[PDB]
Structure formats: C-alpha cells, structure tokens
C-alpha cells in the first residue's frame, strides 16, 4: 500500500472522466496483404464495458480508413475537453515500427497522437492523454502509451494484453494508480502467458482513476 | 508480492558513463557541466546503495567493453543493475567520444538470456543526451554550464529525499513534473518492469 499526496495527483475533480475512442480494426483491403484480425472483436466489446465501469464516455469505431483515424481523433482533440479530467484512445489494429494499419494502408502513430499535443488541444492542456495500442507485428507532457509489444493474439479469446488489462482494471481499476496497473499488466502477459508490453510515460502526476 | 525482491547483500552495481570532451574527429563540443552532474549522481546513488563506478570519456569500444564486463559478472548478491549514461546523442544512438554507439547494444548484453544472474531483477538506464523484460529507461536534454542538466539536479534532489520510500515511477514522475515547470523539454520513461521497484527492504 502507499499514500495518495494530492498535490502529487491528477486532479479528477471534474463533471466528466472524459472521452474514451476505441478503433476497432479487424478488416483489411486485399491489397495490404494484411489478414483479417480473428479475436479483435472480442477485445473491443472488453474494452468498452471495461472504460464505461471506469467513468469513460467511450466511443466505438471499427474498420476505419486512414482518412476516418486522422480525422476522428483531430476532430476529438477540437472539442471542448474543459469539464473531462483527461481523454483516452484505444487502437487495434495492424501494426509496424512506427506505424498502425487502417484498412486502406498505413498512418504514422505521430501523426494520430499529435492532435493532442498541448498547443493544438488547449482544453486537454496539463491532463493526461492515455495512448493504449494492441498493434498486431512542455507539448508532450501529460502523454502516456501502452504498447501490447516492445505481439499475440488468441483467435478464440482475444488478444493477451487486453484480457490482462481489463481484468486488472475490473479489480483494482479505481483504487490503483495507472503506472500500478500497467505494471501487473506487464508481469501478467510475461507470466500467464512470449511477450513484454512497454509503457512510455510522460505524465507529470500520479493517475487514479477515481 | 507485487514488488521486487530487495533481500540481498547488494543494491547492486551503478555504472556512470561520463562523456564531456569528445575527439576532434567527432565533432561534438565539450559539455560543460557533466561534471557537475556526474558528482551529483555519484552521491545519490551512493546513497541509494549502489555501488557507483564513473568513466569518463569511454569510447564506442570501452563502453560495449565496460557494460559487457558488468554483464559477465555474478550479480547473484545484487538486487538490481543501474547504469546512467551522460553524453552527446541522437535517434536511437548514444555518442561516444570516438563516435556513435546504439543505445541497443549497450543494454543487449544484460539481456535475459545474456546476464542469467540479473534475469527478473530489473536493470536500469538513465540516459542524459545532448528477454525484453524487467528494463527500465529514464531519458534526458539541455544543460547549462555552470549548474548542470534540469534532469540531473531533479532526479538527484528527489532521490535524496524520497529515494528510500517512493516507487521508482512515483520517483520519476515527480522529476517529469520538476522538470516541465522548472525550465520546453519533458523527460521519458519506458518501463518494461514487471513489479513495483523499492530502494529497501
Ligand atoms: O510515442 C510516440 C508519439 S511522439 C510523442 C512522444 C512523446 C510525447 C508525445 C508525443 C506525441 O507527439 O504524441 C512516438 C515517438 C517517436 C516515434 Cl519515431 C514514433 C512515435
């Protein structure tokens, strides 16, 4: 167990969680030679009962192009984010170094997550903007992502990061904080499952969630 | 349960890679104020209980040496490995004083399969610039010469004062938030850690 200095938290004090976007991408144009994502499905329906328990207004969109990931989230970074202590964003998708699959081709995750940076989304200014990618192989602070690899996939359960991320969220997603939890999400796909998820943090404070 | 294992002998070994004059050849300037950064760095994680060793001025060669060796010993007794890199840099690659070195080959030889003494105890690297599991990268990336780098200064500060009762993330949170409001520039952590990391006990 360990305190919770509030000077050193995230302020939750706000009428809203705030937004929570899953792109659910299972289906591929032939001429990307990438395959159907079996289990995907099942990954998205966790993941949105999961956000929803935790407070999140989450958003599902699936088979998008890359034209519909660009503008989806630089239309979500132009609303009005003033009453939501902080914004989160899911991608499933097809993925590369540096790069995630639409159904047409390819977008760098730079480009997605950028929409976000402090001076082109003043009203996520000082919250944090939780990344959290399952892709299948200051202006930044206030960033965090999750990636699934430094990755599996069971066709018939759903993917092993985000089974282990939402079990741990049902547990202990209100009274752990976020680094707390990626962490035992890091030892679970290591553990029950090989596989290492990789968390890069830019945050300035300490995220709970309640 | 869900912390590291600090029962052992040592903390562990802390390696500082000292960079400031850098070959003609190279063409990087001296980076005044390393020195002020590494004594700091010396005492906090001496006083953390690592046992520190500084380098200055490695090489390409003498670094992938240096860290080879430390990953040849018998860390058996130790709880952890710690190595903290102060030098010139770019995308994916450290500077020696002879050249560039990827950051990728200094960190492989404590792989799991290479350093089977260290495997499930984490390692870490601190990177101040200018298999896979249980790593931890803190990086930098401006430094003024006579006081020494933000990260630096914040890093050493916090550790003196929360270095034995704060979880490494809880640590290197507080340095991001020192550092975006005391100078922009925004350190990074990536963790691939797979339990909470306690200085003690
Ligand atoms: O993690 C990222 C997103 S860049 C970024 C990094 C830290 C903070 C915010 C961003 C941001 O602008 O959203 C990345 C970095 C390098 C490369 Cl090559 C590809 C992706």
């Not at 919250?127 to 206030?142: G, S």
């Not at 430094?150 to 359960?157: A, C, L, M, Q």
């Amino acid at each position: 167990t360990r305190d919770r200095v509030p000077t050193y938290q995230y302020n939750m004090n706000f009428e809203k969680l705030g937004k929570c976007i899953i792109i659910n991408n299972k289906n591929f144009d032939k001429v990307t030679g990438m395959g159907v994502r079996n289990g995907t499905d099942k990954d998205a329906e966790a993941l949105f009962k999961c956000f929803r328990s935790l407070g999140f207004d989450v958003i599902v969109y699936n088979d998008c192009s890359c034209a519909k990931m660009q503008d989806l989230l630089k239309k979500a970074s132009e609303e009005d984010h003033t009453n939501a202590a902080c914004f989160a964003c899911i991608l499933l998708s097809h993925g590369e170094e540096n790069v995630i699959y639409g159904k047409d081709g390819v977008t760098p995750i730079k480009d997605l997550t950028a929409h976000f940076r402090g001076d082109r989304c003043k009203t996520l200014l000082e919250k944090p903007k939780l990344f959290f990618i399952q892709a299948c192989r200051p202006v930044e602070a206030d960033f965090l992502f999750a990636y699934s690899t430094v990755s599996w996939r069971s066709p018939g359960r759903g993917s092993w990061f985000v089974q282990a991320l939402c079990s741990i969220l049902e547990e202990h997603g209100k009274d752990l904080e976020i680094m707390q939890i990626l962490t035992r999400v890091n030892d679970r796909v290591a553990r029950h499952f090989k596989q290492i998820p990789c968390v890069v943090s830019m945050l300035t404070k300490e995220l709970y969630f309640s």
